[PDB]
Amino acid sequence: SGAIYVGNYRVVNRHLATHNDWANLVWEDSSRDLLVSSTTAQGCDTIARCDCQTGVYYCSSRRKHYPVSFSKPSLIFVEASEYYPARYQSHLMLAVGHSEPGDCGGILRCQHGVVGIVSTGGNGLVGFADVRDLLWLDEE
Numbered sequence: 489s490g491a492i493y494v495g496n497y498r499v500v501n502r503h504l505a506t507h508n509d510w511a512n513l514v515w516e517d518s519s520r521d522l523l524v525s526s527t528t529a530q531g532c533d534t535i536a537r538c539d540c541q542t543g544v545y546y547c548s549s550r551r552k553h554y555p556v557s558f559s560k561p562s563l564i565f566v567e568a569s570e571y572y573p574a575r576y577q578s579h580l581m582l583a584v585g586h587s588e589p590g591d592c593g594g595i596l597r598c599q600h601g602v603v604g605i606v607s608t609g610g611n612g613l614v615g616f617a618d619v620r621d622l623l624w625l626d627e628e
Protein backbone atom coordinates (compact mmCIF):
# COMPACT_ATOMS: atom_id res chain seq x y z
CA SER A 489 0.00 0.00 0.00
CA GLY A 490 0.92 3.72 -0.11
CA ALA A 491 -0.01 7.01 -1.81
CA ILE A 492 1.37 10.41 -2.99
CA TYR A 493 -0.21 13.55 -1.45
CA VAL A 494 0.46 16.67 -3.59
CA GLY A 495 -1.85 19.74 -3.31
CA ASN A 496 -5.48 18.50 -2.99
CA TYR A 497 -4.71 15.17 -4.79
CA ARG A 498 -4.14 11.62 -3.55
CA VAL A 499 -2.34 9.34 -6.08
CA VAL A 500 -2.77 5.58 -5.55
CA ASN A 501 -2.43 2.33 -7.48
CA ARG A 502 -5.78 2.09 -9.38
CA HIS A 503 -6.09 -1.57 -8.21
CA LEU A 504 -5.78 -0.54 -4.46
CA ALA A 505 -8.12 2.52 -4.80
CA THR A 506 -10.86 2.60 -2.02
CA HIS A 507 -14.63 3.43 -2.20
CA ASN A 508 -13.67 6.96 -0.99
CA ASP A 509 -11.03 7.33 -3.82
CA TRP A 510 -13.79 6.43 -6.38
CA ALA A 511 -16.35 8.67 -4.53
CA ASN A 512 -13.81 11.57 -5.00
CA LEU A 513 -12.42 10.45 -8.45
CA VAL A 514 -10.43 13.20 -10.28
CA TRP A 515 -8.73 10.98 -12.89
CA GLU A 516 -7.96 7.26 -13.52
CA ASP A 517 -6.07 5.31 -16.25
CA SER A 518 -6.46 1.46 -16.21
CA SER A 519 -3.49 1.14 -18.69
CA ARG A 520 -1.26 3.04 -16.16
CA ASP A 521 -2.57 1.42 -12.85
CA LEU A 522 -3.10 5.07 -11.58
CA LEU A 523 -6.07 6.78 -9.87
CA VAL A 524 -6.12 10.35 -8.51
CA SER A 525 -8.80 11.35 -5.94
CA SER A 526 -9.50 14.79 -4.37
CA THR A 527 -8.38 15.51 -0.74
CA THR A 528 -9.59 18.22 1.73
CA ALA A 529 -6.21 18.52 3.59
CA GLN A 530 -3.28 19.99 1.51
CA GLY A 531 -0.53 17.45 0.52
CA CYS A 532 3.20 18.12 1.21
CA ASP A 533 4.80 15.85 -1.55
CA THR A 534 6.51 17.46 -4.61
CA ILE A 535 6.32 15.67 -8.02
CA ALA A 536 9.74 15.50 -9.80
CA ARG A 537 9.94 17.56 -13.06
CA CYS A 538 12.98 15.81 -14.61
CA ASP A 539 14.20 12.76 -16.60
CA CYS A 540 16.21 11.11 -13.75
CA GLN A 541 16.75 7.38 -14.38
CA THR A 542 18.21 6.91 -10.87
CA GLY A 543 16.41 7.24 -7.53
CA VAL A 544 15.48 5.46 -4.28
CA TYR A 545 12.26 3.46 -3.70
CA TYR A 546 10.67 2.17 -0.44
CA CYS A 547 10.15 -1.64 -0.28
CA SER A 548 7.65 -2.37 2.57
CA SER A 549 8.40 -6.18 2.26
CA ARG A 550 12.04 -5.43 3.38
CA ARG A 551 11.29 -2.25 5.42
CA LYS A 552 14.16 -0.80 3.30
CA HIS A 553 14.85 2.02 0.78
CA TYR A 554 16.86 0.77 -2.25
CA PRO A 555 18.78 2.95 -4.74
CA VAL A 556 17.90 1.79 -8.33
CA SER A 557 18.49 2.61 -12.02
CA PHE A 558 15.13 2.43 -13.89
CA SER A 559 14.06 2.44 -17.57
CA LYS A 560 12.31 5.46 -19.19
CA PRO A 561 8.46 5.24 -18.99
CA SER A 562 7.32 2.70 -21.67
CA LEU A 563 4.49 0.42 -22.82
CA ILE A 564 5.62 -2.79 -21.02
CA PHE A 565 3.83 -6.20 -20.95
CA VAL A 566 3.12 -6.87 -17.20
CA GLU A 567 2.97 -10.70 -16.69
CA ALA A 568 0.44 -12.77 -14.62
CA SER A 569 0.26 -10.69 -11.36
CA GLU A 570 -2.56 -11.17 -8.74
CA TYR A 571 -3.72 -7.53 -9.44
CA TYR A 572 -3.18 -7.73 -13.27
CA PRO A 573 -2.62 -10.97 -15.27
CA ALA A 574 -0.61 -10.96 -18.59
CA ARG A 575 -1.57 -7.38 -19.75
CA TYR A 576 0.06 -4.18 -21.21
CA GLN A 577 0.89 -1.21 -18.89
CA SER A 578 1.98 2.22 -20.24
CA HIS A 579 4.17 4.87 -18.49
CA LEU A 580 5.86 1.92 -16.62
CA MET A 581 9.54 2.04 -15.49
CA LEU A 582 11.47 -1.18 -14.64
CA ALA A 583 14.43 -1.61 -12.28
CA VAL A 584 16.19 -4.68 -10.80
CA GLY A 585 14.90 -5.01 -7.20
CA HIS A 586 12.44 -6.71 -4.79
CA SER A 587 8.67 -6.09 -5.27
CA GLU A 588 5.83 -8.24 -3.74
CA PRO A 589 2.08 -7.49 -4.27
CA GLY A 590 1.96 -5.54 -0.93
CA ASP A 591 4.92 -3.31 -2.05
CA CYS A 592 2.58 -1.40 -4.53
CA GLY A 593 2.26 2.30 -3.46
CA GLY A 594 5.90 2.48 -2.27
CA ILE A 595 7.29 5.81 -3.60
CA LEU A 596 10.26 6.09 -6.01
CA ARG A 597 11.95 9.51 -5.55
CA CYS A 598 15.03 11.44 -6.84
CA GLN A 599 16.59 14.80 -5.68
CA HIS A 600 13.70 16.56 -7.61
CA GLY A 601 10.93 14.70 -5.63
CA VAL A 602 8.37 11.93 -6.39
CA VAL A 603 8.98 10.00 -9.66
CA GLY A 604 6.32 7.28 -9.30
CA ILE A 605 4.92 4.47 -7.16
CA VAL A 606 5.57 0.67 -7.21
CA SER A 607 2.96 -1.05 -9.48
CA THR A 608 4.56 -4.39 -10.65
CA GLY A 609 6.95 -7.08 -9.29
CA GLY A 610 8.25 -10.65 -9.90
CA ASN A 611 11.42 -12.18 -11.46
CA GLY A 612 13.75 -9.78 -9.54
CA LEU A 613 12.10 -6.76 -11.29
CA VAL A 614 10.20 -3.81 -9.73
CA GLY A 615 7.89 -1.71 -11.95
CA PHE A 616 7.08 1.93 -11.14
CA ALA A 617 4.06 3.81 -12.56
CA ASP A 618 5.51 7.21 -13.59
CA VAL A 619 3.56 10.36 -12.45
CA ARG A 620 6.11 13.06 -13.66
CA ASP A 621 4.22 13.75 -16.99
CA LEU A 622 1.03 14.64 -14.94
CA LEU A 623 2.00 18.36 -14.70
CA TRP A 624 -1.58 19.21 -13.49
CA LEU A 625 -0.77 17.46 -10.12
CA ASP A 626 1.16 20.70 -9.05
CA GLU A 627 -1.82 23.14 -9.67
CA GLU A 628 -5.69 23.34 -9.53
Ligand SMILES: O=C(O)c1cnc(-c2ccccc2)s1
Nearest residue numbers: 542543544555556557598599
Ligand atom coordinates in the same frame (compact mmCIF):
# COMPACT_ATOMS: atom_id res chain seq x y z
O1 LIG B 1 19.41 10.78 -4.80
C1 LIG B 1 19.01 9.66 -5.34
O2 LIG B 1 17.84 9.39 -5.52
C2 LIG B 1 20.07 8.73 -5.72
C3 LIG B 1 21.42 8.80 -5.63
N1 LIG B 1 22.14 7.72 -6.07
C4 LIG B 1 21.33 6.78 -6.50
C5 LIG B 1 21.79 5.49 -7.04
C6 LIG B 1 22.98 4.92 -6.59
C7 LIG B 1 23.42 3.71 -7.11
C8 LIG B 1 22.68 3.06 -8.08
C9 LIG B 1 21.50 3.61 -8.53
C10 LIG B 1 21.06 4.82 -8.02
S1 LIG B 1 19.65 7.19 -6.40
Ligand SMILES: [Zn+2]
Nearest residue numbers: 538540598600
Ligand atom coordinates in the same frame (compact mmCIF):
# COMPACT_ATOMS: atom_id res chain seq x y z
ZN1 LIG C 1 14.84 13.88 -10.81
